[PDB]
Amino acid sequence: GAVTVVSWGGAYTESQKLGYGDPTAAKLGIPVNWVDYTGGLSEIKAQKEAGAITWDIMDVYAKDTIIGCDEGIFHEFDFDKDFLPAPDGTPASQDFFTSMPSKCAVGNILYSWNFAYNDAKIGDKKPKSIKDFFNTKKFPGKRAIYKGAMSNLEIALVADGVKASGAQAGGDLLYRKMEGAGIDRALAKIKKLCTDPNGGCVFWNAGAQPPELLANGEVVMATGWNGRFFNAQMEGTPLVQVWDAQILDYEYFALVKDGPGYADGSAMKVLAEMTSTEGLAGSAKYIAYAPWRKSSIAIMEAGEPWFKDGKTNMVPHMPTAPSNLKSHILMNPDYWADNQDEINEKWEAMKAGLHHHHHH
Numbered sequence: 001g002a003v004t005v006v007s008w009g010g011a012y013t014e015s016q017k018l019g020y021g022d023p024t025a026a027k028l029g030i031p032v033n034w035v036d037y038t039g040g041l042s043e044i045k046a047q048k049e050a051g052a053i054t055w056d057i058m059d060v061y062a063k064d065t066i067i068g069c070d071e072g073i074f075h076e077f078d079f080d081k082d083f084l085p086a087p088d089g090t091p092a093s094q095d096f097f098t099s100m101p102s103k104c105a106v107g108n109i110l111y112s113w114n115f116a117y118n119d120a121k122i123g124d125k126k127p128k129s130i131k132d133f134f135n136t137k138k139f140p141g142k143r144a145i146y147k148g149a150m151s152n153l154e155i156a157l158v159a160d161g162v163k164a165s166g167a168q169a170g171g172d173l174l175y176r177k178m179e180g181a182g183i184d185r186a187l188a189k190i191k192k193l194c195t196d197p198n199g200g201c202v203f204w205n206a207g208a209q210p211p212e213l214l215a216n217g218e219v220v221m222a223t224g225w226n227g228r229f230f231n232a233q234m235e236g237t238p239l240v241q242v243w244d245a246q247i248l249d250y251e252y253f254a255l256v257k258d259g260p261g262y263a264d265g266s267a268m269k270v271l272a273e274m275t276s277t278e279g280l281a282g283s284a285k286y287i288a289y290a291p292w293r294k295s296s297i298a299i300m301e302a303g304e305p306w307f308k309d310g311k312t313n314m315v316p317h318m319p320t321a322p323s324n325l326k327s328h329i330l331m332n333p334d335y336w337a338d339n340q341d342e343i344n345e346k347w348e349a350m351k352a353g354l355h356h357h358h359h360h
């Protein structure tokens, strides 16, 4: 019977299907099919409440591993029994480079939220910083920003000169600066950008939209996920990524309880093989997302140039390359799992105010 994996489409799903989905299906004799979504838990909640679950494995935001575990949607793993050791025998829990954020999480890749511009359209002045993203005088034009508050509030505060620490024990220091007053400042900063006649905002929802909007000249700068910009660059689109105040984030799979392949063990078998050392390394032959396992990272580095063409080195494009980390923010999934409802109410009220004050 087939196992249904849910992911984000475009270049990301392609990297997964080619890197580890199709190889897993061929090795196990369990078909592995892919469904596109745009994140969150609303679809799976609807399926679960209807008693009509068709999804088996979901590629999810870090915060949704926590929420989906707490809501009883996802299966709590027994990590070293369920996931494969590294080839040298290292247990999975010691090969994955840090701890899981929830008992329902297993890592796949690391990715960055950053921004890009179209070097052929932007003009002679070139954006170089997150402050430039917000600078409508030096860089007039529309911006594309993510539809949700998550990531936007962080970059807004850093653009306001509030300091992030990057990764360290306890998470990024930025989040202690995101209580009520900090959230209000961040909302005001986004509102300012989106209401400026020399700015304005398109809210993106799907990962392919930022590179497409830049390729077509619809915005001058767009936030997005670095792998989506990387894919467009490798297709010949003259985008340039800016890594100042990039947000380093961690992605996971979760196993859906009571999905079609749950009781018979088929979904778990697929998941264990997809998240193997070889599987996670294989995905990085296609997209600039870093494998979660130390063993997979070592394979990629030893195998450079690791890109599918046997020519392009992948390490300099990774979210975790030292050059790309110089001013990064580390995403905090507990913050968003805990606070997204309260914050989203204010965020959506801000967005509704943009329209009610907009004159055609």
Ligand code: PRO
Pocket: 008, 009, 012, 111, 207, 225, 227, 228, 251
């Ligand atoms: O779709 C993408 O490119 C990013 C990577 C993790 C999931 N979202």
